[PDB]
Design a protein around this ligand. Structure first.
Ligand SMILES: [Zn+2]
Lengths: 117, 192, 144, 76, 142, 151, 65
RNA sequence: GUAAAUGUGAUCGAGAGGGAAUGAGCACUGUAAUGUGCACAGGAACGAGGAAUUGCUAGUAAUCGUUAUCUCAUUAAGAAG
């Protein structure tokens, strides 16, 4: 069975690419967000992800990273991490699997409970 | 371009020697006023019998701007009737104008139904129509017959105009307008 | 005696292209709008690269003309139809662009939606329940 | 039954015999008497007006009208 | 004299179109057979030679502009001249311009043949393009 | 005036006929004898009142003589099947669905009625459609249900 | 005030500054009453429809027709 | 982004009317897309509307566009002309 792939690129290569390179793969609206540069908040989130993937060893899980950076597109640097995304009320936890690339963190969390009359 | 003579309708038709041929109608049908194109803006509607002085084919094109969507499209109406006159002049062999005159003469109902009872219940009775109302209804019926006939039928609208007008002038059962004139007169008689 | 010499050819009732049936009497343009993935606009594009007169009826076409069109459908990018004219652009699974025909459309939309659902993409969950996903308001209209 | 996309030889023959003694004729007549579609009533009618069998008497926008051998106009 | 007004447009635009094609003075845009003239249009043109009818009508716009001594014509002016009413679903129809790319290509083709001269505020005719038109009309009316 | 609504025909494999108490009807004014220009929907669930506060299912003013016209449905159903369906009362070779009570009008025609069939095997056939007065269904056990000569 | 924000490029190491555009209700408060709704912005007035009608005759507006 | 209905010629031929839900994209405004534009698809109800009910007497009613008018970074299927 074949390795995971996003828009032609293997996870081995994809996890080694700079954000500048990854930008050539993403959809148009996500590209425009990376071209217009990261906020001071987003930079701290990303530096923690890079630290965490490096620091974690063995079989023990790294601690959760929380964020209110809802519009950030998912990057190959936060694969396998547990991340809490703010729902307007609480940090809703999720694990960033490979299949989430090309989407924003807001796409995986509901700010409004489903309705059943 | 085509002519340097006297005024003819669509520059084609004679505009003379025209007879009404019902003395009850005479004063109310304008075939006098020589006009090259059935269009005038003459502001007679703001008057007591001014809508009886508008020329005949004018009254006849106004009747076409209907079914809602065609309001205001008076050029389109002129285009349509122009063609119909070619079909009719050919078919009949006589001034399209005398076909139109005779269509009106036959298609107006002479007796009608109305409520008369005032000081109690309203009971229906026959009544007698005026000259002016008689011709107003004739145009209405000729128009309504044409419109509804063409709706979802493959035939061209100018052709349907020629079918109805000939028949009406000839007083045949074939006309929608003529049949419905018989119906109204029969019901009027039933309530006599 | 005089002869007409402007008549269409002896015509077949209906013909088969794409596991789809095409009414032979129908003029080639609106007739190729029977196959899924051939809309109006793209139907005219193919016919002017296969080079068939638009005014012939579907049952007049030879085997040769039907092969010419069949070839252009399997590979539009060979006959200079540019990628911005085609159904499936920058395919997430392949990188390439391709034109999906017939039952390939539903199959591809299904395998795509199913993958999103397996990982909890909110967009795919809504389409499965019959709800809207392009920001439309759902209070007043779209009932039952 | 639906309309047709040919004028076969025996329909063609009898139309020539029928178009004489008719007065004004139009796209609809060929398509409502015989079984021809509008797209093949145009082509046949245009052919007969090149052959001098019929004559055109109007062609204003798409509205188009023809005459056969027993037409006769008004006279002054 | 203002010689252009002596003949009918629906005889002149078809007449010049043949003189263009038989000398190849303008060359079709890539994919002319499948492109639309505007985002307001529903389908691509019914005549394969639409590009030449554009070229024939562009020189007519310029001849009459020259006849009336107007200011030179701009790429924006031509785009509004050829505009139309776009269909928008469930909404009123709206006026939209022609696409510039066709017009730019025609004007650059005509520049290379010496038929059209670029001014600081628009495009203008040249002696050869005037005389072709003159010599056509002198046969066409007779 | 009182009108009984019967369902008539030849019935085979049928336990019960159920009828929606919703009738498209043609009505005639009993004052001026003019037919109402359109059919009117008479429904059992439509609640109206006479000028004397009596419940009726239809209240219509005659356009010609201004007279009020009223119709009441009396369901002749013996039972409600699934609390929804009015079981028409079997009477010999026919089914009595309802009684229509007209005041100030005549009922000239009932156009259609939505009919449901309960088979002798306990299967429901909702909203049955007649072709030329015939309806027939077969179950997975080869039991036939049919209505012939429907009126 | 024209406020400024820092943003990082894709490297998350180089920084640049961008300016926040002044738009929306936040700076267009009624000059008579601080209201945020029904502000007439025409002719460089910045006055709400309630306040306008009491002062209109002092400013010099009239109802001619 | 400087009318549209409309005028002439071609074309299409009775769900080639209609554009709703949805796919992989390509751009724009913005601090942020969730908003808007574009291309290719996809192709739902609806075939002239029950009981009732609302204006309108002449350049009026209805039709057709347009707003260097108001809202307005971007957004009119709203008002006021
Ligand atoms: Zn205020």
């Amino acid at each position: 069975f074949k390795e995971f792939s996003y828009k032609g690129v293997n996870l081995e290569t994809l996890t080694s690419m700079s954000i500048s390179e990854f930008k050539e793969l993403l959809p148009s609206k996500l590209r425009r967000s990376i071209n217009r540069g990261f906020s001071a908040a987003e930079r701290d989130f990303i530096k923690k992800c890079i630290k965490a993937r490096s620091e974690n060893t063995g079989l023990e899980r790294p601690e959760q990273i929380n964020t209110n950076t809802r519009n950030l597109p998912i990057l190959p640097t936060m694969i396998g991490l547990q991340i809490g995304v703010y729902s307007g009320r609480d940090f809703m936890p999720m694990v960033i699997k490979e299949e989430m690339l090309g989407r924003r963190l807001r796409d995986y969390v509901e700010t409004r409970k489903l309705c059943t009359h | 371009t085509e002519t340097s003579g006297d005024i003819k309708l669509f520059g084609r038709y004679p505009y003379t020697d025209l007879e009404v041929k019902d003395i009850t109608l005479e004063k109310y049908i304008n075939v006098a006023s020589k006009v090259i194109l059935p269009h005038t803006s003459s502001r007679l509607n703001t008057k007591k019998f001014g809508r009886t002085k508008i020329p005949v084919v004018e009254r006849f094109v106004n009747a076409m701007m209907r079914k809602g969507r065609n309001n205001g499209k008076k050029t389109l109406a002129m285009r349509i009737v122009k063609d119909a006159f070619f079909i009719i002049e050919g078919v009949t062999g006589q001034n399209p104008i005398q076909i139109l005159v005779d269509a009106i003469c036959n298609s107006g109902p002479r007796e009608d139904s109305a409520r008369i009872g005032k000081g109690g219940v309203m009971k229906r009775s026959s009544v007698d129509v005026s000259p002016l109302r008689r011709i107003n209804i004739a145009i209405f019926l000729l128009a309504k017959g044409v419109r509804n006939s063409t709706f979802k039928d493959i035939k061209m609208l100018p052709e349907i105009i020629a079918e109805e007008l000939i028949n009406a002038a000839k007083n045949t059962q074939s006309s929608f307008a003529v049949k419905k004139k018989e119906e109204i007169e029969r019901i009027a008689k039933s309530n006599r | 005696k005089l002869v007409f010499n402007n008549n269409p050819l002896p015509i077949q009732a209906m013909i088969r292209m794409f596991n789809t049936n095409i009414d032979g009497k129908k003029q080639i343009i609106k007739a190729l709008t029977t196959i899924r993935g051939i809309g109006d606009r793209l139907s005219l594009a193919i016919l002017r690269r296969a080079k068939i007169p638009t005014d012939k009826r579907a049952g007049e076409l030879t085997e040769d003309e039907l092969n010419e069109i069949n070839e252009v459908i399997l590979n539009p990018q060979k006959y200079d139809i540019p990628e911005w004219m085609l159904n499936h652009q920058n395919d997430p699974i392949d990188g390439t662009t391709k034109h999906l025909i017939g039952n390939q459309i539903e199959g591809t939309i299904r395998l795509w939606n199913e993958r999103g659902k397996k990982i909890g993409l909110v967009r795919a969950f809504r389409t499965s329940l019959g709800l809207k996903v392009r920001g439309q308001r759902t209070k007043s209209n779209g009932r039952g | 039954v639906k309309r047709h996309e040919r004028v076969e030889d025996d329909i063609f023959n009898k139309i020539v015999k029928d178009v004489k003694n008719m007065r004004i004729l139009t796209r609809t007549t060929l398509s409502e008497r015989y079984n021809l579609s509008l797209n093949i009533s145009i082509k046949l009618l245009r052919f007969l007006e090149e052959n001098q069998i019929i004559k055109l008497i109007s062609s204003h926008r798409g509205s188009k009208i023809y005459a056969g051998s027993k037409y006769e106009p008004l006279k002054v | 004299n203002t010689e252009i007004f002596k003949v009918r447009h629906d005889t002149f635009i078809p007449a010049l179109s043949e003189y263009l094609r038989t000398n190849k003075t303008v060359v079709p845009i890539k994919n002319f057979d499948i492109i639309k003239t505007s985002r307001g249009k529903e389908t691509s043109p019914l005549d394969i030679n639409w590009y030449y009818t554009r070229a024939a009508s562009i020189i007519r716009k310029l001849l009459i502009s020259k006849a009336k001594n107007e200011k030179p014509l701009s790429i924006v002016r031509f785009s509004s001249e050829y505009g139309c009413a776009k269909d928008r679903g469930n909404r009123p129809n709206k006026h939209v311009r022609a696409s510039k790319g066709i017009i730019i290509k025609i004007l650059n083709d005509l520049q290379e043949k010496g038929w059209v001269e670029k001014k600081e505020n628009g495009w203008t005719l040249k002696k050869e393009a005037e005389e072709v038109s003159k010599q056509l009309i002198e046969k066409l009316i007779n | 005036m009182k009108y009984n609504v019967y369902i008539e025909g030849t019935f085979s494999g049928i336990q019960s006929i159920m009828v929606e108490q919703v009738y498209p009807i043609t009505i005639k004014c009993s004052g001026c004898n003019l037919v109402h220009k359109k059919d009117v929907i008479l429904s059992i669930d439509s609640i109206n009142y006479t000028d004397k506060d009596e419940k009726v299912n239809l209240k219509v003013k005659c356009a010609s003589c201004t007279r009020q016209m009223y119709i009441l449905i009396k369901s002749m159903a013996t039972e409600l099947y699934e609390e929804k369906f009015y079981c028409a009362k079997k009477e010999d070779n026919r089914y009595l669905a309802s009684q229509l009570q007209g005041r100030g009008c005549y009922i000239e025609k009932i156009k259609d009625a939505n009919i449901h069939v309960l088979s002798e095997k306990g299967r429901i056939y909702p909203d049955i459609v007649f072709d030329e007065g015939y309806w027939r269904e077969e179950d997975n056990m080869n039991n036939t249900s049919s209505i012939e000569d429907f009126n | 005030m024209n406020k400024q924000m820092i943003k990082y490029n894709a490297d998350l190491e180089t920084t640049f500054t961008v300016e926040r555009k002044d738009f929306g209700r936040t700076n267009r408060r009624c000059r008579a009453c601080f209201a945020y709704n029904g502000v007439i912005r025409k002719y460089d007035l910045m006055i709400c429809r309630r306040c306008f009608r009491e002062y209109a005759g002092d400013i010099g507006f009239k109802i001619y027709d």
